[PDB]
């Protein structure tokens, strides 16, 4: 949109967990319009955290997003008559929305033969490090943080 700033206006309340930031990852596991099979699986994948981890999934959950939380972006920009990359630090509204995809994309990759148990091994083993998806955020975390380049670029 060359015209500026389409409004956001999205709402996300929740029944029991009392968190806006938990009804987001119900809105990404839900494929094919079936909200009627999401929280039946999601809340049966959080009540099995305390039977697998040491604690309730609430105080593990902000840690689980906190360690997976991506820092730096590399949005390529052909500067001034050249062509190579530039590091951009993400504005804080965008970064959780970039962040939550790595739970679900690797939820469909861990061959535990039960999706409400295969997916929940990345909230366990996410507050604790070296999980499944932390490898990508450390792979791209050093993408241009160590590879610092022309950092006076606009976009």
């Amino acid at each position: 949109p060359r015209k500026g700033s389409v409004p956001k206006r999205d709402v996300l309340p929740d029944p029991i967990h009392n968190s806006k930031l938990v009804t987001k990852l119900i809105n990404k596991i839900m494929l094919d319009g079936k909200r009627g099979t999401a929280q039946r699986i999601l809340y049966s994948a959080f009540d099995l955290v305390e039977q697998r981890s040491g604690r309730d999934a609430l105080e593990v959950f902000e840690e689980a997003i906190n360690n997976i939380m991506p820092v730096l972006e590399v949005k390529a920009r052909r500067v001034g008559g050249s062509n190579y990359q530039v590091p951009v630090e993400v504005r804080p509204e965008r970064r959780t929305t970039l962040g939550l995809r790595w739970l679900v994309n690797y939820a469909r990759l861990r061959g535990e033969k039960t999706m409400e148990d295969r997916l929940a091994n990345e909230i366990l083993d996410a507050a604790n490090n070296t999980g499944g998806a932390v490898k990508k955020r450390e792979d791209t975390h050093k993408m241009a943080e160590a590879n610092k380049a022309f950092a006076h670029y606009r976009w």
Partner: protein, 114 residues
């Protein structure tokens, strides 16, 4: 080796050189972008200057002098980020000099690029 130094830097478009010495010209520890692994035209960034003045300046280890008194050879893109970042090793810059060799129409230059 005792507490003195004049700073000789140059910065062409390739491999901005920093070399700090005493009142004579004796070579404490030279430093470049080339000792660091910058080859693909990151030989000259201000970030290449950011690890230029550091690794020569901090590599004193015999003098650690009182001032630096920079002499700026090489008109190029790595000038002032090698003199601000020279202070980051704690050496108290207090007077700068700019010496680039200006001819008086001596020898005819090489031809124009295309």
């Amino acid at each position: 080796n005792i507490e003195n130094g004049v700073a000789h830097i140059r910065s062409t478009f390739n491999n901005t050189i920093v070399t700090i010495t005493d009142e004579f010209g004796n070579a404490l520890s030279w430093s470049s972008a080339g000792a660091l692994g910058f080859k693909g035209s990151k030989k000259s960034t201000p970030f290449a200057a950011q690890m230029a003045s550091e690794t020569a300046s901090k590599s004193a280890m015999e003098h650690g002098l009182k001032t630096v008194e920079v002499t700026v050879k090489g008109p190029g893109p790595g000038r002032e980020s090698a003199i601000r970042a020279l202070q980051s090793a704690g050496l108290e810059v207090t007077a700068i000099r700019d010496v680039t060799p200006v001819p008086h129409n001596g020898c005819r230059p090489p031809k124009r690029r295309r």
